[PDB]
């Protein structure tokens with residue numbers, strides 16, 4: 001019903017740098033979507049600084065307790081690094097000693113995990129986006145092999161869409177993960193927040209097409 | 221003859237977190253070394269923040285002009301990200317729009333480069349360490365394939381050691397790269413700086429063993 005400042009600022013910048021675009025788009029499904037999102041267009045030092053901030057404040061506000069931030073290769077690698085830093089920078093004394101880690105796709109001269117031993121540490125997984133859960137599934141396999149404990153996940157944008165329109169539980173991608181693994185899936189923003197930001201920027205008519213999109217596909 | 225503050229602070233932290241250790245060590249060569257360095261022990265949010273700062277101030281002080289900061293997979297990936305951010309944070313208006321990029325080891329569903337097109341951009345390569353030049357060589361191949369122009373490189377620690385004791389030009393690893401490619405190889409610190417930091421922390425005797433190490437192997 002209201003957006004935190006960090007969430008306004010994130011959405012303002014995503015639209016400005018064209019990471020978030022509005023129009024008529026199709027997913028793999030073939031499903032219509034009224035926007036497109038590509039976190040990769042946060043691609044300058046300024047925009048990465050702001051992104052790091054936005055993830056960090058989301059994590060700080062969740063009150064989740066964790067020891068390590070893990071990013072799945074490849075796109076999670078820089079995000080885990082920049083967020084680990086910004087948490088120490090703005091989070092106070094409880095985030096000074098957070099570690100980061102990530103996986104190589106393949107070992108070498110050994111190691112799949114780059115970082116300190118995950119054994120007995122509480123892990124937050126950070127990525128850009130979640131759809132079928134395949135990066136999450138791979139991270140759990142890797143982590144649980146190393147005796148780490150995953151306590152949560154965070155993505156940039158939660159689409160808050162039902163994975164299937166036939167499915168009568170009406171579970172989104174993040175919900176599905178959260179149920180299977182028993183952990184929170186946090187996000188900087190969700191579809192409801194995009195909708196709220198748009199109030200007073202778009203026409204009555206346009207407002208009614210987006211607040212019907214969510215009737216057909218919105219989760220739970 | 222004097223250390224910048226950022227260089228003192230970096231060396232203080234490297235010793236405190238055990239990234240820099242003093243004692244008797246052997247390289248691959250079989251060559252004795254009076255220290256060991258592992259940048260990977262900068263592994264918490266606090267320490268990564270400080271590392272990012274130290275690279276950024278080194279880059280700002282060099283006055284090198286560049287458009288993109290490139291990190292070779294894997295260890296350069298987080299360093300390029302965290303440094304790109306910190307440059308926007310502390311560098312003022314000329315570092316706001318710096319981009320970062322890095323390579324995948326192998327393509328997929330295409331792309332070796334993750335980031336905006338390198339064509340016609342001036343690239344600074346960032347890595348942890350340089351020895352034989354093999355990561356640098358690979359980055360040049362990748363970059364020049366993408367029509368980018370490398371303008372420089374930066375590593376954490378320049379060992380300032382001759383690659384070979386028989387070699388009568390007396391070129392270090394960084395010098396060798398710099399000659400072959402015609403670009404600066406910057407570093408946060410070099411061996412001479414470590415020596416200077418140690419003045420008044422170590423005994424007269426110990427000072428004389430390190431200021432003889434550099435007589436046998438110190439470059440140029």
Ligand SMILES: O=P(O)(O)NP(=O)(O)O[C@H]1O[C@H](COP(=O)(O)O)[C@@H](O)[C@H]1O
Nearest residue numbers: 073074075127129130131132133134135
């Ligand atoms: O991170 P990449 O580009 O190396 N690899 P890719 O598998 O394309 O990663 C994307 O898909 C994942 C989401 O997987 P899924 O949730 O769609 O199955 C995220 O990790 C995102 O980076």
Ligand SMILES: O=P(O)(O)NP(=O)(O)O[C@H]1O[C@H](COP(=O)(O)O)[C@@H](O)[C@H]1O
Nearest residue numbers: 293294295347349350351352353354355
């Ligand atoms: O970065 P990694 O661990 O994926 N791969 P590796 O080839 O071990 O990288 C180290 O060697 C390079 C230095 O290569 P060379 O200068 O010793 O030949 C640096 O990129 C450092 O990260």
Ligand SMILES: [Mg+2]
Nearest residue numbers: 073074075135
């Ligand atoms: Mg990914």
Ligand SMILES: [Mg+2]
Nearest residue numbers: 293294295355
């Ligand atoms: Mg490397």
